[PDB]
Ligand binder design. Sequence first.
Ligand SMILES: CCCCCCCCCCc1ccc(-c2noc(CCCN)n2)cc1
Length: 430
Amino acid sequence: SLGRGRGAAAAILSLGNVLNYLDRYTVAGVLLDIQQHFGVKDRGAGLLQSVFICSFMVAAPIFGYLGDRFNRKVILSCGIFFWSAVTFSSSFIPQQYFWLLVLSRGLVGIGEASYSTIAPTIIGDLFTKNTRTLMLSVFYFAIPLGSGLGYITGSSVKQAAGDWHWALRVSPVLGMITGTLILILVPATRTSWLRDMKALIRNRSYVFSSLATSAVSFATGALGMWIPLYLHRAQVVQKTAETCNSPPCGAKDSLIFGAITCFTGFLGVVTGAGATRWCRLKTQRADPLVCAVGMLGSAIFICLIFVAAKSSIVGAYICIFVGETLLFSNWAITADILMYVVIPTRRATAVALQSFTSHLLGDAGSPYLIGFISDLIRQSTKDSPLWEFLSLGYALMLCPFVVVLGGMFFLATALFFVSDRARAEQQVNQ
Ligand SMILES: CCCCCCCCCCc1ccc(-c2noc(CCCN)n2)cc1
């Protein structure tokens, strides 16, 4: 009935999503200064993101529940105000205390989980059909954009202000403004869990696809959480004796990584769509096959980046470009597979299930696992920047391995995709 209001609501929701991801990844951008100032080792650095993801995983379903039974717009505004306040207050934590930052991360994760679980429901309720899917697409466009802007803002504010605290002191004002706008312009708005559990435990292609998504989450969490620090360590190790005065400044690598991520999000989605469209003419199980090929390519390039980074950095940058492109090529394809195999009646429930699983074996403790392994290698050898480099590299060498199992699981679901799709088709429509 009204177009301007719906358009403004979509715009403010998309801006809120951008802000959400920016606040999510600013800490990953600025972790080096935090680690240096607080005097902690890689264990706590991983623990930050691990606690964030754990809080998000725990708090998503209850927030969704409160969303469908109670009012959504007020809950959305309360959540954005909550994580904005916690983010602003986190910058004032003194050096002598560390667990304060971790609990602040947990509260921020709670707020972001509320926002992420709530907003798609209203953004899809407002519109319908082609308009709805276009609006959902422009909504989800915020992820590769949001992560990149988070890296960019963290690095830029660190470089300009000269102290890392201000990295958390530029976003909350935008958060409060976005809360006021979402309150002003936006118009106001399970069953048989046991049976769905029992039915879905027997869907083998569903299980294999969920495991593949878990492996992808593991890889992307570890990479997007640890790569800038590894690059900085490599740069300083090269600078040990290449010039003896070359700037090892960290404000030149995080920006490049952020811009690269913004590019590869869209690039990988586009190339995955093109590849699946091309390959659907040959066979019927082309989607898991192209997912598996993308996983194999990503594993290959993630293998050679950790070797190329020893000598040349531009080689590492192009390798990571190709790696994240081929890694993100399967985003929409996984959801398409899930849409195709699962019966409509439990469909939504199934989706939620996958999220839970993808947040348990994926990025729940993956950054902490990498930190733990790097620390274990550290204590067994000497302490030196060169050994910092090799220890972090050896710890991070675990990602292509799990990517290889992800590709194998996509092959496994490829074998049974046709049979499961046929069974789903026969069951529906009677
Ligand atoms: C280092 C930067 C890492 C940045 C990635 C962080 C991922 C966290 C959230 C997980 C996630 C991702 C993508 C999608 C999705 N994309 O498209 C569609 C359907 C479109 C139909 N035409 N669904 C859903 C959920």
